[PDB]
Subunit: 210 residues, 2 copies
Amino acid sequence: EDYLKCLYELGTRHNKITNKEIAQLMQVSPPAVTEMMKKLLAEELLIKDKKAGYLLTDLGLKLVSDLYRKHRLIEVFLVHHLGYTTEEIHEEAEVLEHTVSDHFVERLDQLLDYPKACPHGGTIPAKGELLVEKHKLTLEEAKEKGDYILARVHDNFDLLTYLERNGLQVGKTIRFLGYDDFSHLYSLEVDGQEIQLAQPIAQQIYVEKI
Amino acid sequence: TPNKEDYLKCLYELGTRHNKITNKEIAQLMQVSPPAVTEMMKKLLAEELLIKDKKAGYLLTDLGLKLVSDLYRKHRLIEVFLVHHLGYTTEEIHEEAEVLEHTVSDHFVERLDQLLDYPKACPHGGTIPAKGELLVEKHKLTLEEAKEKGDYILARVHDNFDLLTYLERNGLQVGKTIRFLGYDDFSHLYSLEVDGQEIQLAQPIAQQIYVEKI
């Protein structure tokens, strides 16, 4: 089931679905690929698309959406209220995230007064609603130059470490200096200083003109 | 399921009633296989959490008490968090508390403590020791070992889910005022006046309710 989680992620790139990208980004061999996908298909969790490889059904998106909700509220609580840092969230986040009941999570929602986002720009779906991200415009995706706002980062620890090591906080203003067509590099002007971002990193940051 | 922490808690409370400590009793309280007991104590001895002793069976070491204390911190701060912040009910707490206790880290518990603004007691009157300080209950005086008659505060009750259910089902609650009418010497009962209404507790229950003469 932990598989559904990766399916939705790559889905936000619009590529294809490889039984080779499955065994790879999950570190488990293809004898479990064919047996995971079958369970999924017969429990109406996904359908096979020729073009996209695999698509999640509404049932699957509601499932995956609930997962993100649980994960994002917990983030808010640990960051905002237990003063956890990126490193600390790296250690304990996912365990209690995988233990707390739906009840806990409902109540956490009230205690935090129904926050609309996690500290990283992520959007928090209502119970049993669907996950629709407020900020979807990756740096890569953006055409025009000028001053932008860093509105969301992928949640990954390695990424955050990267970003903080480099001074890019969700909410911080950022001026886009352009994508070099050969260099494969994006140029930013944050805090009056220049930074060079690779492609893989620029496709995991979401901005907004303003 | 039962880890060494669940044993130390047991043994710990099993000695607030300063008798020996059979393994029969440990097997009884823990609901386990006697060879499992024999196996756990071995480990508990080896970790220098307790030592054997003639009159008491086992005594806890400073390292032991220091651990017991953590257990009680974790358990009572989670208790305080669940009911005050998330509005948990007795039943809810019974269904959920234990797995969180067996899961959250000591760093969670430390941050939690700060979030809760350093509560010196959980909602059932159980006291909440500081990181590293030793469990020393604010309320030791039990109903059964209560001398004088008259008015009393119901200061603490044991966490026990069946006990709580019994108490809510007889409107006994930490905080309410209580008229002790004494032990009836043969009745084998304790008489209380809770909300002007009379009520009779047996020894095993009076033993679990803690009061302070107001």
